[PDB]
C-alpha cells in the first residue's frame, strides 16, 4: 500500500529510489527545483524534453528521474491547466509502476513560478495522491516552505 511522508528539504538530496522533477517542455535547466535536479543530475537532462501533461524517464545508471512537465498556470485556462496537472501525475505514478522501484520523491508540479500566483498546494498534492494512489510506492514530498511542510503534513493525516 503507498504510504506519504513529507520532508522539508532539497529534493536534490532525497533518499529515495527515484526522483521526479518539475521540469518544463524544453527541456532546460529552468530554476527551483528544476535546477537543483540539473545541478545534482545534469546527465538526466539528455534530450528531457517532453510535452505539457507528460513524464518522461531519463536513467542515471539505475537512478531514474521522472521529468514531469505541469503546465504553467499563466498559460492555461484553470480548466485546461487542471487537466495537464492530473495528467502528468498520472504519467508518474506509470513511470513508478514500470520502472518497479520501491520509493519515489516527488515536488508539488505547477506550484511557484509555473503558479500563476495563486496558492496551489491543495490543487496539486490532491492529483498526487490520486496518482500515486495507483501506484504501491513509498511515496516522500518534499517542499521547502515550513508552512506548506504543515500543510501537506496535515492533509496526509487525515487520509488515513
Not at 545534469?42 to 534530450?47: A, D, L, T
Given at each position: 500500500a503507498p504510504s506519504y511522508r513529507v520532508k522539508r528539504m532539497d529534493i536534490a538530496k532525497n533518499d529515495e529510489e527515484c526522483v521526479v522533477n518539475a521540469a518544463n517542455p524544453r527541456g532546460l535547466?529552468?530554476?527551483?527545483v528544476c535546477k537543483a535536479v540539473y545541478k545534482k543530475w545534469?546527465?538526466?537532462?539528455?534530450?528531457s524534453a517532453t510535452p505539457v501533461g507528460t513524464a518522461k524517464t531519463v536513467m542515471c545508471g539505475t537512478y531514474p528521474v521522472i521529468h514531469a512537465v505541469g503546465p504553467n498556470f499563466s498559460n492555461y485556462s484553470e480548466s485546461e491547466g487542471d487537466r495537464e496537472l492530473a495528467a502528468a501525475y498520472r504519467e508518474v505514478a506509470k513511470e513508478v509502476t514500470r520502472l518497479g522501484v520501491n520509493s519515489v520523491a516527488i515536488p508539488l508540479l505547477s506550484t511557484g513560478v509555473y503558479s500563476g500566483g495563486k496558492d496551489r498546494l491543495t490543487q496539486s498534492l490532491n492529483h498526487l495522491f490520486t496518482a500515486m494512489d495507483s501506484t504501491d510506492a513509498d511515496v516522500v514530498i518534499y517542499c521547502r516552505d515550513k508552512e506548506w511542510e504543515k500543510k501537506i503534513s496535515e492533509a496526509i493525516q487525515m487520509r488515513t
Open positions: 535547466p529552468g530554476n527551483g545534469p546527465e538526466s537532462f539528455k534530450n
